[model samples]
Target: NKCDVVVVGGGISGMAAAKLLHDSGLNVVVLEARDRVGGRTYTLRNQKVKYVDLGGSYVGPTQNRILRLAKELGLETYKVNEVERLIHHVKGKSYPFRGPFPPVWNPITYLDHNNFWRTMDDMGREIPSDAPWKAPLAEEWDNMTMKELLDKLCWTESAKQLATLFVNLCVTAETHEVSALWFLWYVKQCGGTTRIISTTNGGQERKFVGGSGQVSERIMDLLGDRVKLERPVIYIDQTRENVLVETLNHEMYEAKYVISAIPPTLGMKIHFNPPLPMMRNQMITRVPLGSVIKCIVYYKEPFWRKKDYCGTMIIDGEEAPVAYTLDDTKPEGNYAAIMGFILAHKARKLARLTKEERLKKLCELYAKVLGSLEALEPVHYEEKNWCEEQYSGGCYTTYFPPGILTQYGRVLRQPVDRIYFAGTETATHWSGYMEGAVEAGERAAREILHAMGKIPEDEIWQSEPESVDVPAQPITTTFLERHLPSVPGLLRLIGLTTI
Candidate 1:
């Protein structure tokens, strides 16, 4: 099969590129390994719940690409319910709080929390979305794992421990899995931790009327048969004028340009003629995907709501198998569900545990936190253990290790000859979410369009408006951002000079 462009991976990123190329009247084809679209955006049909997203469920403000496509695709979204108080369980006790972070009463821990926010934001500002490794202190920051940074930042052991749990929960990997530079870059691209963590106005704010997987399905509909399923591209021979993309089934597709829209590690599986660049090879080899088991437990009602709780519980303690929980019920349908994230080392362990045992474990944990026997009696349970997903290799997005980004990060977005890379991993913004997928896809398409002389030079790096046209729901400032004075307020109050 010959085409102007062969886009590998029928995920959102690939589909997004294909949509643009096809719309511009190019003979573009997308080959996906799985029968389904929406790589990480997997939607499950439950008899009780109707639809449950096992992956990539939520989107919030500032995700312009997704929000735009959402409305364009005739989709409506509603926020995840966060009306009631959320719980923060540390050691053995549950401390209830109203906002994103639990307002810790301990003075030392509280001070540590504020310092962390200030420090992360301050450091994050130095990171450029496109080239984080180019930051002033990139080498120093990149040389250390986030674990080390947390140790250096946290004053109290309890604060350090809780922060570690939060990192594990958000990154879906252990604190040591990522570089300090990478984590800050990630949070900055995500509009800082407030937006990353908050529900009402944060990254986890809303879900589609249908599941997120349908967005890719809609893009597939737009592309028609240009998108192929069950076709895993195993080799890309770009030595010739036209790149040759060979799939697992030995089918050959010759295209002027190729867009590899798969995850970094998955891309490592594909062999290339003349080999990939040394830095690209090393970068992909070092890149590690996040591990996560997303569990949705269906109940007759939001049982915890009775106790005036939001079902948003953070298991900061070591005992719990799951790190975090959120009310998963839709705005209107009321499927009555609570979603829990089984992450990092816990994910691998829980996925190995029998499903029945795993479900029981989460339910018992929920029972302990939610203060209800009903937690253990969820009518139905469904979990997506990304460990078992062969095509993905792992979950979410690939993260940089301690020393990977500084040396090899430049090659991340650079196209090799006629071949280009696009994925959430390559996106400059929201690099682990649906928005990033679209951003990278469109960018890859823009490059090809530029090469084909179908677009102007300035169009290649197009920047969309930051905010979308959605009705404004003002984001209330986070506790630390509003009140806490950058961790040095006490110094100024004491007439001590500081930077």
Candidate 2:
């Protein structure tokens, strides 16, 4: 059988593209390797509690794509618990702080934090969201890693370690692994470094009521049987007029165009009939996924809140297995929950330990920070090791090394023949978030729609604006004129459509 389009990977990106294509009077089919949808946006359910997102959970003010879609699907969101105090655990000591700095931290550490953010803000402004490679000093910046930048800028040992921890938490990779240029571009995409790393006005500000995964489930419900689970695409033959997709189980399908919504690293596993270009091959090979495992512990009640704590904790050190934790308790629910993230080498090392052993260690660690032995007695525990998944080698997103961005970056999202790319990494903004995934999906669908002559080239795809508390800055009036002059009237005509 044949269809107009075949979408590989039934995550938010694939399903989103499928929905758009289907709505536009095109026949489309989505193939997913997992038995379910959502990809990295998985949710764990508890009978006692409501749900806990083991994957991508938070949505901020600026991430309009996912928030709009969530509202359209009738999903509600609640504010994340505010941080009244942060417990910083390091070297067998708990240092509590009211605001941004811990009382026990060296004065230089606070200065380093300010200096680093200011430098980031300055660098962030230099790199445009759509075209990072075109930025001045792009090559010079791309030649160095984030670790090197931190070492060069930071003063004290405490500052260096803290900056490293923050970078690791943001990218899900070691600071030494990601390029400085890539880091700066990422900061620009989220508006600023503070916007991405902060819980108050940042990407972690709000969460869906039931779970983030429900967004994908609702989209899949709308697509009906067009989505096929447990179908892992092993190869694609795009040499002929129509593209051919084959599953690992030997199932085959033909389509006029194919949208590959899987991670670039994962896409390397699929064999192409006529091999991809050298640049594309090199890009897929060099772009490595960041390792991350999310853990959630459920308690009978909000005990940490009783102690006047926001449940925000940071364990900063190479020895610490847990990197970050935040309050995941539902506002109007009877139960309470705490979510934590383990990154990079820590995640790899912890994957070797037994579930009971890991859970025990986490409980003990939380107990020390909470200043209560009762933290060990949790009602339930759930975790998702994204590195272990065959379909998804890692979590959050992938990153570039020292010089990959300047050399082969532009080819990342460029379509080859009838095959197009659509994943969070392909997004120009919010690259690793759920919002980026939706944006990429919408972009790929629109590209195909235009190529197929179904839609006029001048008439861009437009979605209804879902009102946000903080309206986005005008792109047409400012950013468009400065960076993209060709599309001067595009945004004004289409009303802030995706680039």
Candidate 3:
């Protein structure tokens, strides 16, 4: 078949691009490896919980791209429940703290915590989000790991532990695996560390009422017959005039242009005829997706909520494989859940055990942290190991190690003749979330549109108007949490008395 464009990987990113390009008077064909769409944003219908999201699941302010897309698809979002005290499990002591912000019981460690991220946001602001390699300290930062940066910035061991825990929880990767420069640039793209972590107005604040995966499913419906599932693009031969896209099962298409919207690590699976530029080759090789097994615990009722707990828990101790927990109960629905993630190192280790073993262990851990033996008794349970997913390889998104970004960052989004790149990884804004996927996909569509002379050069990188009306939130608030790095915050980081 011949088409205007072939969008490989019918995930949120690919499907989003296809919808835009298809609507713009072009015959766009999307080749998805999976039998179904939504890629990373997966929602499975359950007998107990009704629906459960095993992949990318939340959106908040500043992620206007996906928010706009979700609204366009008629998806409603609800605020995550964080009304009661959150349980923090560390060093064998489980205590409750209000909201997403963890209390610094080690008083002095607070400075270390604040200073580290203050310096991070401070340094991050200096680097350009689009071209992080051009930063003045890019070389120095790129050479060091996040682990190294934390040790240098933190004064106390507790502070370092908290910092690492936050990193591990957020990225689902070990501190030593991520590059300092890349981590700073990554978080900076989404506002800052505070914006990324906070549950009220931050990245984790809101989720779709029908599951975030429905956004992609709805987008696919709009482009009906345009998307071809179970058709993985295995090879591409690009000549001067057109590109030959061939799938794993011998399905072929001749397209004027191509957009590969899968993860970079998975992109390497497709064989390019002329072969990719050496730098792009190295980039795809260097980028590794963070591992995570997202587990959802189903209960007859939100038992923890009865005990004045918000159902949010964190396990910093080595005793439990579950690193973080959240009140996963559906708003005004029958879903009763407290979702926990087996992240980073724990994900790798716990992945070997049977599902029942992992489920039982997670319950035991919850029993201790939530102070309720009732945690062990659940109506049902489910989990998704992104590591085992052949097309995805891992979850969240890929991370940059030392030396890669500074050296090969230029080729990230740069087109290879007629082939373009789109994924959460290529996005400059909200790069590891559903928001980033939407932005990246739309940007790639803009690039192809520009190539087709349908849009001007300036229009290719245009930002969405901030005037987008976010859907009316389901709930009113969550502890009214908001923060920013300022002069007072800096002074307090150094414990200076300011009148």
All models, RMSD in angstroms: 2.5, 8.9, 3.9
- Candidate 2 — which pairs collide? none
Give candidate 1's error at residue 104 in angstroms. Answer: 1.5
Which regions of candidate 1 fall more than 4 Å away from where they truly are? Answer: 466-499
Tell me the whole-model lDDT of each prediction, alpha carbons only: 0.85, 0.83, 0.86
lDDT of 2 by residue, 384-411 (tens): 9999888887888888889999998899
Q: What tens digits encode model 1's per-residue C-alpha lDDT throughout 180-248?
A: 998889998887877788887788888888899888999888888888888888999988888999999
Q: What is the TM-score of each candidate against the true structure?
A: 0.95, 0.91, 0.93
- Ten residues in a row with the worst lDDT in model 2? 480-489
For candidate 3, give the lDDT of residue 104.
Answer: 72
Error of 3 at 344 (Å): 1.0
Top model number, lDDT:
3
* Candidate 2: clashing residue pairs, number: 0
Error of 3 at 193 (Å): 1.1
Q: How do the candidates rank by lDDT, highest first?
A: 3, 1, 2
Per-residue lDDT over 1-499 for candidate 3, one digit per residue giving the tens place of the 0 to 100 score? 8999999988888988998898899999999998999988899985677888999998887888888888888988888888888888888778898855677755456556656767878899988999999999999999999999987888777778878888888788999999999999988898887788778767888889879889889988888898898998899998647899999989999999999999988878999988998888878888999999999988888888889888888788767788788889989845788899999989999989999999999899999898898999988888999988899988899899888999988888999989999998899999988889989999999999999899999988868755244432332222312243333455576685543
